[model samples]
Target: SAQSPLLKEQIETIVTGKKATVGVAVWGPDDLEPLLLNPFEKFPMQSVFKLHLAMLVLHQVDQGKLDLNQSVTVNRAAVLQNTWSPMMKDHQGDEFTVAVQQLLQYSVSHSDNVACDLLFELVGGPQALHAYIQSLGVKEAAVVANEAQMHADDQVQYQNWTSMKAAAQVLQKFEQKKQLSETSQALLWKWMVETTTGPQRLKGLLPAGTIVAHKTGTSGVRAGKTAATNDAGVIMLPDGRPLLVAVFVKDSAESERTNEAIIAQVAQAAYQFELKKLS
Candidate 1:
């Protein structure tokens, strides 16, 4: 029933083959500073970049720069690599039109690779997204390259990453309306609440109907095998307490089921920890 053994088994079982390191922090409304709990470390956020893409698009919406209702036809060439993946189908050689809002849904809900690439481009490409992130007062936030360019350059191996602290700070910035306009923050929360990746992780452990907005990311394989998976998001606890927390498992040789369990464990502990503080 103690914290250490419980968390250790969760880590060992989920992250079997390699070392698993994770960072978790919580930012609250009445806190002196963000709270860091457990292994408190940093790890790269993989497809979690999709969250940034969503933030950028919503910000554009606030400025009337991009329209969520305005439809754009799918660019097969742009989304080709993503099409090859299971989360999204290739709609090449044909015009598959959808609203920018819909694309954001796909990007967050399914972690669609093409969805991220397309939305990233619609926001004036990665360079633009990078600039926007910096303008948010986030020093550690980094945008290395567009997904399409990385594929074209034969750079399957990547270093486009963020620490747990930075990632959580970015989310907090969104919440504080520092990185985006108020209107944009509203839309970002709307889309994030709808994402499907974490129903079993953060949502599963919390009180029923609790509202928590967040994102999940799994890393590329290392040494011909995957060793990392990360989940982060803003937690709005049942008692009107909200905190941003990120859980990262890196270089883990654990199996898929094990990794997922570990991810859930981290969320459960975080939620309970905050609940205790509020009580």
Candidate 2:
């Protein structure tokens, strides 16, 4: 546990003077104690909840309640203006159709808000997703709002949140390869590894080509402040071991650059700590 104190110092140093509510947790390989700071405090998930939504959707696929290849229509009403969506770029019409698999990719990899809401609807809303996570033993997580609702209501965004420990648990179970079927696991892992967002966060300080399957979340800036910036995932070490890392920054008065750097620095510190364990 030499890493615990060092990790805490590094995280505290990064968040100092930023006026941010930060939570971080690192779950290393088997039999290793996790390192956590404010792990139980709730922080708005933003688009990071899409990772749970993706897993719930895939869980349905595993149970035969959903089909990955099934087609879904995206009408103009479903497309919200001024949001991140590949569907909007790909189709310009009153209505268009896409597949479930494609939506999963868009929601997770691209953090597409439109595709995320569509998948949320298909999976029977936030309550269902919440129940799904609870079923998987995540006790302190909440998935209560869709992207559209979050955009329309600031309160909803603040209310839809998760703890860093719970988020890390999800990633830990995922990397352990126990909570998902092989096919579903492969799909989720592929999308996470291909994620195009948060280039400056979780994997930011790692070596080039380091395998980190992570999801990032960003809330809109209001009054020159951000409500949340987060990243959680399983990162591969140099010695072929994997570690689960989650960092959430809430109520941040810092710039996006600083918010992201907090996460990147924390991740790098943990990576270094774990590498020394193997060395």
Candidate 3:
């Protein structure tokens, strides 16, 4: 059940323009660690970095460095030049403020780049973020971004280095409350399980009440109504398990719907494979 040729072809059919590379890691109880497909290979995290930012801030909360109720002003230049904060910039300099809670929510739920910039800056920028990322034992995963790169008008081209191995380890840490304090862990996990994206992936296959604390992201060169890249978050399986996965298409120059289907197919294959393992 590792990987079947049919599943590979089904995934390829969904890929539109460029080649697609997919990775999955399923984590169960202590006796059942993560089983990965190209888990250590690196892929850009896109908006999935929000999960890391969330945990970092939560860690800060545990250290009494920031309060959930604390507010921060949205910088006009910060939002406008970054090219990903159109919504936040529209509210800029006019009493544009947000709670740390809201910031984390916006970051994760909407993959809001504005909140990402603010938090990254507050936590001592990308350098500090990389430091924290490495502390998690995934040094190969890099959070690459700059203040100027976060604007809406500019192309949203920020890239994050990651791997299925890193994703699984990080998610496992979060699930076990090893990534943050008890209070922070609870809050983070609650919001994660309630993520709004990926209706056709992990959530689509499980029972109605299944918990899938996951994140998703889409980015690619637009060519004739087609996307080039799409990705989702750690698809937590049944019993609070961690199913950290990353799927990417380098140049999906055709069929956007097919790309979505490809994502579903990859997730479904991993889900089925892991489920059978438990039996």
* Tens-digit lDDT track of model 1 for 164-206: 6677677787666665676567777787787777576656667
lDDT of 2 by residue, 158-251 (tens): 7788887688778877787777799999989999998878989998899899999999998888898888999998898988888888899998
10 residues in a row with least lDDT, candidate 2: 1-10
Task: Estimate, for each residue in 1-279, the C-alpha lDDT of model 3 and write its tens digit.
Answer: 444455455544544343455555545443355555555556656667788888888788778888888897775654534345534744535557778888887777766777777887678877777788898887657776743463332244435657667777777777677777777888887777776676765565555776677776666444453322445455556655666545644344446665666666766766665566674
Counting clashing residue pairs in each candidate, in order, gives 5, 0, 13
TM-score of every candidate relative to the true structure: 0.80, 0.95, 0.78
**Cα shift from native, residue 8, model 2 (Å):** 2.6
Inter-residue clash pairs, candidate 1: 14-258, 16-254, 17-253, 18-253, 227-252
Candidate 2 TM-score versus the reference: 0.95
Question: Against the unseen true structure, what C-alpha lDDT does each candidate score?
Answer: 0.66, 0.86, 0.64
lDDT, ranked from best to worst: 2, 1, 3
Q: lDDT of model 2 at residue 204?
A: 87
Ranking of all predicted structures according to TM-score, beginning with the best and ending with the worst:
2, 1, 3
Scored by lDDT, model 1 comes in at: 0.66
Q: How many backbone clashes does candidate 3 have?
A: 13
